[PDB]
Structure formats: C-alpha cells, structure tokens
Amino acid sequence: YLNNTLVEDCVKVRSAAVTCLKNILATKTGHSFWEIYKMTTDPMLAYLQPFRPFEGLDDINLWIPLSENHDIWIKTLTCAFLDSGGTKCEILQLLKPMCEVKTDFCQTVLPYLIHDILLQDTNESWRNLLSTHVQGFFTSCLRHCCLDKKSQRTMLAVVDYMRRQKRPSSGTIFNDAFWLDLNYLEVAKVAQSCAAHFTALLYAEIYADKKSMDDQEKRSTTISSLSEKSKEETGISLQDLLLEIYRSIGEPDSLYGCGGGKMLQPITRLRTYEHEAMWGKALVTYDL
Amino acid sequence: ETAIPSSTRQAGIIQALQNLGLCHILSVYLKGLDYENKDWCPELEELHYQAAWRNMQWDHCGTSYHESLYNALQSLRDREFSTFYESLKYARVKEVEEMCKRSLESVYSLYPTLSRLQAIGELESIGELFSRSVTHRQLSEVYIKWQKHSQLLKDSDFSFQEPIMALRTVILEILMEKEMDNSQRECIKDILTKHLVELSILARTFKNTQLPERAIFQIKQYNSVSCGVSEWQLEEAQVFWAKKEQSLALSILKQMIKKLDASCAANNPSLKLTYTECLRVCGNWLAETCLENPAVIMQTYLEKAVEVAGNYDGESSDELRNGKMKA
Ligand SMILES: [Zn+2]
C-alpha cells in the first residue's frame, strides 16, 4: 500500500511514504521480510532495493464526533490508538506521520491496529472496553443519528476482518466470530441500512446462534420467541429484519420461512402480496 | 375504455370503487375530479354526498336522497333534531314522488326505493332513541329488531342490503364517538362488533371479501385481543379462508384452538360454543384440503367438539343445540 500511495501527485503523501519506507526497511522486521521475500519473482524487489493507556481512549465524544467529520473521526481514532501503549510492532507504531494525511490509510489499517492491540490484551482489559465502545457507536448509529454511510461501511469492514482472525486460544470459527463481546443484531440492522444483505443475514444467524447457546447454558425457542425477546431487550424485532433481508435479496422462496403467508400483521401480508404480484388485493390492503 | 361518455363512465368507476372496498382512494379520485372539473352534475354530486356520508367525511360541506341523508347525519352529530326531522321528511317525500311519477310495472324497481325508505326509517328510529338518552334495554331491543328484520331480508339481494348495513355501521360509529365512558360504551361496542360480524357473513355469502375485511379492520380498531379470543377472530379466519388464503386462516384457527384449550376454565358457555365451532371448522378445512390423514385430525377435532358440546348441554339453549347439530 505504501508503494501504491508513493506514486501520487501530492508531495506530502509521497514524502511521508518514503520516510515510512526508510523507517520500516531499516528494522529487523524489514530484514526478515526481505529474506523471506527474496525467493519470489516479483519486480517489487527492484523497486525497494535502493531503500535498503486506558485513560486516553474513554471518551463518548471521541468515538462519535460524526457531523460531516468522518475523516477527522478516523484520523483521531488512529492517533488515539497509536499514541497508547497497546501497539507493540514497530510497523504498527511508526505509521503515524503518513496516516495523518492519507484518509484511506486510516480506514485500511484501523482493523490491523485493533487486532494488534487485542493480541496483547491481558485479562480482557482492552476487550471489554473496545466491545462497549463499539456497541455504543452502533447504538448511536441506530438512533432514529443520520450518520454518513462511510463510517458504517468502515466499521462493517473492520468487523469482517476481525471475524477472520484466529483466536490465540483453542476454539472454532464460532469463537472466532466473537472476538468482541457484541450482539450482532444491531450490526445486522446497520448492514441492512447499508444494503449489505449477505453480511446482515450472516450476523443475524450468528446472533441467533449466540442467543440459543446462552439459553442452553442457562437451562443447564421458536423464531417468534427470539423476535419478541429481541424486541423486549434490544428494541429491534429480528423477524422483521430477516423478512427485509430475504425480500431485498431477491431470492425466490425465502420470505415464507420467516412467517410469509402465516402472519396476521398487515406488513407481512403486504410483503407477500407484492412478492406474489397479487396487486388487486394488495391495493385493497394498502387502502384498508 | 375511453369511448364511453363521461356522464356514466365516472358513475361506473365510482360504483366499482365502492364495491371494491376502496374508500380513501375513491375520496382522492373524487377530489381530483373536483379539481379538474368545476361544475357538478346531479348524478356526480349525489355520488359525492354518498361517499361523504359513507366515509364519515364531515369536512366536506332539490337535494338528493344521499344529500338529505348526509345532512340528517350531520344534524344528528350536532345534536340538532328539527332540521334532521325536516330533512328526513323531505327525503321521504322526494323518494315517494320520484318513485310514483314513473310508469312502474316492474317489481324490481321497487326494491331500491324500499331500501332507501327502510334506511330513512332506521335513521328515524335512531334519532328517536338518541333524542334524550340511551339505555341498555333500548339498544338491545333495537338490535334484536334489526337482526329479526335482517332475517326477513335473507332472500333479498346484496345490492339492496349493502346501503342498510353501511348506514347501520355509520350510526354505530357515531354512537361510539359520542358516548361517555361507562358500561353503556361497552354495550355499544359489543353491539357494533356483532353488527360488523353479521355484515361479514352477509357479504361472504354473496362472494364479497373486501367489505368483510373492512369490518374486521374496524373490529380490530375498536376491539382488542386478550387471553380469551372472541368470535371475531374466527370471523377473520373465515374471511381469510374466503380470500383463498388457506394457510393464514389455518394458522390463525390453530392459534385460536391452542389459546382456547389451554385457558378455557369454563369461563363462559359462549366461549365453549365458539370453541366447538372453531373445532368443527378446522376439521372441515382439514377434510377438504387433506393436509393430514383423517385418523388423527378426526380424533383431534371432531370428537373433541362433540364431547365438549355434549358435556355441558344442561341448558338446552337453541344457540347450543344448533351448534351441536352442526358438529
Ligand atoms: Zn439523525
């Protein structure tokens, strides 16, 4: 990415990029990278040959200063994360001068620095704080607050990247998807607001599995029970979100599973009428 | 088709919208006609007044029958009786003279006039009842008289009965609107619900599904669900069955059965008879659609209904023996 951003017209960005090249390329990590990377047949070797803590993060305003200030928000998040002692790798510490002027770098390295910080977390000290802050951010987004889609899509990308990270302890992909203590219904609704139907459906399934596991361990459960429990606790009905996902995705026969053709609520009846192209009764239903 | 002259094309469109259960759409369409067309012909003005009184559009301001009916309804809503009685008398005189001026010779032509005069008489009776006060016994006797007369109108056509039912619904809505909070309000609400369900069966027997749906919507607007489901849930299930929505009706009826058989506690014989009717309806539906083998559904529904009816037949009432015979 540094090589890609080194060839732009702006001079500050390329100066920062070459300084980063000189910094990381002079470390032992750069030497090990060169030793591993010398065997491949890539002209990048020719290109790069000549170049050879919790107090500062707890702030409700710092996490959501989103009033047409997405770039400032990501920049200040990156600065506050790098200045803390959580970061350990030199390459994850010396990127400050360049990321301050490049907007896309902050977005593309925020999940990397988050994962690096959570790797060295002890006794879930950082895990709980980050989970609470991310949950608060999602709740703020769900407020009726009119935030630009860039923040939600960046957070969805971060969550998707963190879902693919292997847990240091023994576990499965189910434990991998729960790197942070979150309920995925809110993230699914956010993805629905961003037209990310597949990710929203996956997150809804993950949340349903988590609720089922929690109920099973509490005892040691139909779709309507889960929907009413989500409405009571979270405030958002899971059944309606699943119906919206199955309708907007265009799948032929998927809305009937969530209650299509068997739900007394007028909304489901209207959705079924639209899906089955029964416009004659649909118009009567809308008027009625 | 645009070749039809607008003199009758607009009337046909309005009639089709009325018979399709569309009220707000008809109101907006009529407002658009008023915007695009300035002058009003007698026929379209009469249809406008009919839609105004039928939809309770009190915002909109010789006189036709529908105009006189709307004026009488507005006067009744304003606690004015002199103009109300005068308007009803004028409507009666106009209808009688218009009917007798023609050559007659046809029985079928008498039916609309008879229906209009019956509506005027019903409004007169309502005004007499509401002249000074309303009591439970008076409302009960009025409702039983109306039900008896509707029984006399079983063989009549739905076209001549629909205005009567619409006027009755409007009257009950007006009484509900201007009723103080007491047990009388509950009695009027129950009477309104019963009238709406009777209208639902009346329209269902004439291959109509939009008016029963509107009646169920009004019931849901007024009545509320509870632990013990009433007969209007069963009526909604039947209406959805008539709309070729077999799955939804079956699911609703199964939910009703699950609610009834777990929280019956012999609270009311009416609940017992409606449970028996629901079981019989479910058995008939499963027999007709054949979603399951007869062996289990028969024992689950038909014998259960038979034994429920036979275990509490100590009153020998007609409303129980007819249900037992039907089961
Ligand atoms: Zn907002």
DSSP-assigned letters across all residues of B228-255 = S--HHHHHHHHHHHHTT-HHHHHHHHHH
CB–CB contact B21 A288 (8 Å): yes
Residues 6+ apart with CB under 8 A from A222: none
CA atoms of A195 and B124, how far apart (whole Å): 60
The sign of the dihedral angle between the CA atoms of A55, A57, A63, A68 is positive
Instruction: Name the closest residue on chain A to residue B218, using Cα atoms.
Output: A288
- Alpha-carbon distance of B24 to B30, in angstroms, equals 10
Task: For residues B62 and B43, give the distance between their C-alpha atoms in angstroms, rounded to a whole number.
Answer: 13
Are B170 and B162 in contact by the 8 Å Cβ rule? The answer is no
Nearest CA in chain A to B21: A284
Smallest Cβ distance to B247: which of A261, A281, A287?
A: A261
Please give the structure tokens belonging to residue A231: 């409405």
Cα dist from B55 to A211, B47, B194, whole Å:
48, 12, 20
Give per-residue burial for A63-85: e unless 16+ CB within 10 Å, then b: bbebeeebeebbbbbbeebbebe
Q: Are A106 and A70 in contact (CB under 8 A)?
A: no
Of B22, B245, B248, the CB nearest to A284: B22
State in Å: Cα B131 to ligand 1 middle. 54
A10 token code pair: 């702006």
> What is the rounded distance in angstroms from the CA atom of residue A216 to the CA atom of residue A14?
56
H-only helix segments in chain A: 2-5, 11-24, 28-37, 44-48, 60-63, 70-83, 96-99, 103-119, 125-142, 149-163, 173-176, 184-193, 197-219, 223-233, 238-248, 266-275, 279-287
B243 close to A (CB below 8 A) = yes
Closest partner residue to B251 among A262, A269, A288, by Cβ? A262
Rg for chain A, CA atoms, rounded: 23
The span from the CA of B13 to the CA of B32, in Å, is 13
Angle of CA points B149, B152, B154, to nearest 5°:
115
Method of elucidation: cryo-EM
CB contact under 8 A, A262 and B22: no
CB of B20 less than 8 A from some CB of A: yes
Contacts of B251 in chain A (CB under 8 A): 262
Question: Among all chains, which residue has been given the structure tokens 């998040």?
Answer: A77
Task: Measure the CA–CA gap between B108 and A215, rounded to whole angstroms.
Answer: 69
Contact flag A262-B213 (C-beta cutoff 8 Å): no
In chain B, the residue whose alpha carbon lies closest to the alpha carbon of A265 is B248
Contact of A284 with chain B, judged by CB distance below 8 Å, is answered with: yes
The CA distance from B201 to B216, in Å, is: 11
Chain centroid offset of residue B210 CA: 11
Distance from CA of B304 to the nearest CA of A (A): 25
Across the interface, of A261, A281, A283, the residue whose CB is closest to B248 is A261
Chain A interface, best mutation among B248, B253, B258, by max A CB count within 10 A: B248
Is A277 an 8 Å CB contact of chain B?
no
CB proximity B224 to A under 8 Å: no
Question: Which residue shows structure tokens 């739900």?
Answer: A263
- Nearest CA-CA partner of A137 in A77, A75, A80: A77
Residue B154 at interface with chain A, using a CB cutoff of 8 Å: no
Residue A245 CB contacts under 8 Å (≥ 6 apart), including other chains: A188, A192, A197, A200, A201, A204
Is A284 in contact with B21 (Cβ distance < 8 A)? yes
Q: Are A30 and A20 in contact (CB under 8 A)?
A: no
Q: Which residues of B touch A261 (CB under 8 A)?
A: 245, 247-248
Q: How close B251 comes to chain A (CA, Å)?
A: 6
Residue with tokens 């959580």: A86
Only one residue has tokens 């103080």, namely: B180
CA distance B94 to chain A (A): 35
Closest C-alpha among A76, A70, A64 to residue A145: A64
Q: Which of B213, B247, B251 sits opposite A288 (nearest CB)?
A: B213
Instruction: Give this entry's resolution in angstroms.
Output: 3.3
- The answer to whether A39 contacts chain B (CB < 8 Å) is no
CB contact under 8 A, A262 and B25: no
Q: Is A139 helix (H, G, I), strand (E, B) or coil?
A: helix
Residue B200 CA to residue B184 CA, distance in Å, equals 24
d(C-alpha B201, C-alpha B210), whole Å? 12
CB A13 within 8 A of CB A102: yes
| Tokens standing for residue B188 | 């009027």
The span from the first CA to the last CA of chain B, in angstroms, equals 50
Give the count of beta carbons closer than 10 Å to the beta carbon of residue B26: 22
Radius of gyration of chain B (CA): 23
CA distances to B151, B182, B251, B277 from B144, in Å: 10, 22, 34, 23
Measured CA to CA in angstroms, residue A234 lies from A186, A195, A206, A239, B305 at distances of 8, 21, 16, 13, 42
C-alpha–C-alpha distance, residues B204 and B210, integer Å: 9
User: Do A205 and A177 contact (CB within 8 A), yes or no?
Assistant: no
**How many CB atoms neighbour CB B128 within 10 A?**
13
Count of A-B CB contacts under 8 Å: 28
Interval between CA A146 and ligand 1 midpoint (Å) = 4
Helix, strand, coil percentages in chain A from 3-state DSSP, rounded to 5: 65, 0, 35
